[PDB]
Design a protein around this ligand. Structure first.
Ligand SMILES: O=S(=O)(NC1CCCC1)c1cccc2nc(-c3ccc(C(F)(F)F)cc3)[nH]c12
Ligand SMILES: O=S(=O)(NC1CCCC1)c1cccc2nc(-c3ccc(C(F)(F)F)cc3)[nH]c12
Lengths: 543, 543
């Protein structure tokens, strides 16, 4: 019974294969067939390429040795190498042309999700070219999806030497009959075969996956669309900044490039951006996913006024200052979306670009205090009285999140007549069913985050209605002229798309996004669509 | 008795003043004298510029209003504005031309060091131009050096209205006679004067500083060279990454741009880079100052083999992977310098550029085990026996750091015949004097860091001599071909400049740095020189 899957890099997990490009260059340069591939392999176990693959020498020290092998090979074939012949150029272009074989990575991901141990076993070199970052970027995106990465240059052993296969077996803690080994080179497949491993000679990906599906019994081809990569909380870099005595802000950080500040809603976590964090990082951004004040590992002072928009915004500015960031792109959802419009309104200098998921920008009415409103969205009135909603929401944490985190068609909670009913969960079951959006594990992460501070801090965000209105009134003569994106979600019955209709009177250059069949919990409801809209907008409006 | 100093931004803390550029543009465009400055101030308290300074409108909404004021002013003067006349261009160039007035910032820093409360009071706008990052960068570098930053657009009040001066007084918690107010505009100086504040009309910086030195009694002009900005540990962003179960790495992070990994020596801290962290961040780099394994807030497992170079290097790679960084510039000192050469040797793909302070690169001798050596640098033998050196170094933490952290001429500890003497501190006083390099406060920071794990982890770095040699021997055929810098320190009697003499046989493209009258503790001994060498090398060899 198979329990481990081993994949090669070149010609398996990454396409096109550099070996195939040597053949491509020889036909373009009208060189004799095999000349370059033969120069590459000259002296076999005793040759220059074996030394490079064993980590004895670096790529740059190898270029001159390959040049000599090429010259010698061309002399015995009685041909001439062209005038501009350069192994450096040939290999630079080859390495750069090589991209991830997405369907092969997808199948490796599927096998691992089904409890398989996965590994990359590759004959590779120590890359010291000025262009090495290209390969380092490829290796990083690939390695994260596997249990092990075995590189010849790191272990001092090469395929097809038997020791590397015995090394692989020991690393996997598996018997040979328990392993599927996938390779594009017949020769490197034979020693795995001799030990008794299942072997797949990869030419075209489809046939290779048909063989892999047949032998594993797991559907690898024609599967439904997978979810984007998520976050394992213990694998993240956790950051902490003291913004004022007694108030410290927690964040998760991933990637390099322009800074992207992710601001969650009520009653959420940095973890609500789990499907965005890896995608935006891979897209070339330095993601900072916040635990907003009152939540998770961030401070939760008890006082109501500590959660007014003015204070939260000033603290976000201090957060940038202490991290030494002149600007960040501010992306918010729900209450985070509200903060985000205010950051753009009050601190346009510190906001590269601003994006809101669901939460529209509506200017304060200077003639009417918002406290005056009305049982249509009465959860607001219910959230006002300190202690009441804290008691209901903290009673059973697991029930709170299973009742709240529900998709469009999953019998969502009523937001009307909640004061009359005397609670949010008064017509909800004691043991709600688990939503298709979340696992029991993800629900339990939220449960643990809420055990520290509870719901006072989070609810205090609803308790500064008049204070926020007074401050919002100071911005009545301003417009938002920095890059802005408004993302509406069709089936959000609290933050309705229609509520956003007039935003263009105040944000003339506003760009829009729209998600059909999407409820309130946008990030987890439609992560694939959210990531597409955000990345396209970031690459155009935020560099 | 004065206890607070208040500074204006334009024409005081930042030069040239935008108002002076309006006069510059009018003489270049052959416009009537004062035309643009008069258009700028049109309608005074009721005008467009007052609205912009009160935060009623943003810069972009103001450009059209200034255009109209210019057209109206040119009509009454019976002149024509040129064909390409644009307030946008005039202001973009003006804002960008404005740089920090270094001698004025220096004096504000001096006054604050002497216990003065310092503040910036400025008439400023809400900048929403595409070019806003320039001003945001200027404001960030300036604001950090002051107790308060008061901006008209943020408080809804403007100079010369009396309320802003009363607001300033309340913010400073000071009586008027306790405050020095410095401004370049006579009109904005008069209300401070009326309240009873000491006022300085700033034209040229020298006369302004002469008046300021005379009234405060503190030498502000002709002072010796100040040290670079340091780090207040509680003002930093603290990052944590789990690299393997039970091993978590702590780091301090500051800045944006290419990633720069700072690796301290024995027995140090991230804090040893205190004078570099702000300088390299300001230079346009994302600094990550490590607490190396065994130190501070990083994990300190007890086992010796957990501190061999192979494991420390693999963990540094995992650190990059978890932060989602394909590369970092690796800068190391002492044992960190050793790690750094190995990162470049074993993982050139993950190292953008490599720099070592004091620690040379010397290839392992494959014919001789380094355990065989010799009482000349016998502190190595002394550090071998587990428990011995831990007991001496932990007995009195304050004494350990006061005895170790000493400048070239400060009667440094003997590194010879330490086994014969039976300890490092056997000929050292019980109460050492405080070195000119460190304050009692900085010594006490190290003391607190060492109370957690002690010296087992740090000493275990010296306990893998044979293991490191065996691994180093695998790299004997390689050269370092990535960008590299070797910084020698004249008076380092353990890591001697002469020890680095042959490095060019293995690092042909090696760039060098050299620090005269510098001991072992390079970063704190010569911070100004270290920062100059590092920044020049980073901007040329690391982008
Ligand atoms: O309170 S608001 O000002 N209401 C406005 C918005 C539309 C009508 C009035 C408000 C303002 C901005 C964002 C908001 N997100 C929520 C909300 C979120 C989750 C839950 C749940 F957890 F119960 F599901 C209930 C309410 N409310 C928000
Ligand atoms: O142990 S080494 O291999 N010695 C080599 C280096 C030159 C001769 C042999 C070694 C290798 C690399 C870096 C080193 N930094 C120190 C050191 C640092 C501080 C203290 C102090 F805290 F005591 F001051 C004592 C010794 N030693 C190092």
């Amino acid at each position: 019974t198979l329990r481990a899957a081993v994949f090669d890099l070149d010609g398996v997990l990454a396409l096109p294969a550099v070996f195939g490009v040597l053949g491509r260059t020889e036909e373009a340069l009208a060189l004799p067939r095999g000349l370059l591939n033969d120069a590459f392999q000259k002296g076999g176990p005793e040759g220059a390429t074996t030394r490079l693959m064993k980590g004895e020498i670096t790529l740059s020290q190898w270029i001159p040795l390959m040049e000599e092998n090429c010259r010698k090979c061309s002399e015995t074939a009685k041909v001439c190498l062209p005038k501009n012949f350069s192994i450096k150029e040939i290999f630079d272009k080859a390495i750069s042309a090589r991209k991830i074989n997405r369907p092969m990575l997808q199948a490796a991901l599927m096998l691992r999700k089904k409890g398989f141990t996965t590994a990359i076993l590759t004959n590779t070199w120590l890359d010291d070219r000025a262009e090495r970052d290209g390969l380092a970027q490829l290796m990083c995106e690939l390695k994260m999806h596997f249990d092990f990465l075995i590189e010849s240059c790191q272990v001092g052993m090469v395929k097809p030497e038997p020791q590397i296969y015995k090394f692989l077996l020991d690393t996997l803690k598996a018997s040979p009959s328990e392993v599927v080994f996938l390779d594009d080179i017949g020769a490197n497949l034979k020693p795995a075969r001799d030990l008794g491993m299942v072997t797949i000679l990869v030419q075209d990906t489809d046939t290779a996956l048909k063989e892999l599906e047949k032998v594993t019994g797991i559907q690898l081809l024609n599967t439904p669309a997978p979810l984007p990569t998520s976050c394992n909380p213990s694998d993240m870099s956790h950051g902490y900044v003291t913004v004022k005595p007694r108030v410290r802000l927690h964040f998760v950080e991933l990637g390099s490039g322009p800074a992207v500040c992710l601001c969650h809603g009520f009653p959420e976590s940095w973890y609500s951006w789990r499907y965005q964090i890896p995608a935006l990082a891979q897209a070339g951004y330095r993601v900072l996913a916040m635990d907003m004040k009152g939540y998770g590992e961030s401070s939760a002072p008890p006082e109501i006024e500590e959660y007014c928009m003015e204070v939260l915004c000033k603290e976000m500015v201090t957060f940038l200052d202490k991290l030494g960031l002149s600007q960040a792109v501010f992306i918010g959802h729900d209450w985070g979306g509200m903060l985000v419009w205010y950051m753009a309104l009050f601190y346009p200098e510190r906001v590269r670009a601003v994006a809101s998921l669901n939460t529209p920008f509506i200017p304060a009415n200077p003639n009417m205090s918002p406290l005056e409103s009305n049982p249509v969205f009465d959860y607001q009135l219910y959230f006002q009285e300190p202690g009441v909603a804290e008691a209901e929401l903290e009673q059973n944490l697991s029930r709170t999140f299973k009742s709240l985190f529900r998709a469009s068609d999953e019998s969502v909670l009523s937001m009307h007549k909640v004061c009359e009913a005397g609670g949010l969960f008064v017509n909800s079951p004691e043991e709600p069913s688990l939503s298709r959006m979340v696992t029991e594990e993800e629900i339990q992460f939220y449960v643990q985050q809420f055990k520290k501070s509870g719901f006072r801090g989070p609810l205090n965000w609803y308790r500064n209605m008049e204070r926020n209105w007074k401050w919002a009134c100071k911005s009545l003569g301003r417009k938002i002229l920095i890059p802005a994106l408004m993302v509406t979600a069709e089936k959000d019955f609290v933050l309705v798309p229609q509520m956003s209709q007039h935003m263009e009177d105040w944000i003339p250059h506003l760009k829009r996004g729209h998600i059909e069949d999407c409820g309130h919990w946008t990030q987890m409801d439609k992560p694939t669509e959210v990531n597409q809209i955000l990345i396209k907008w970031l690459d155009s409006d935020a560099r």
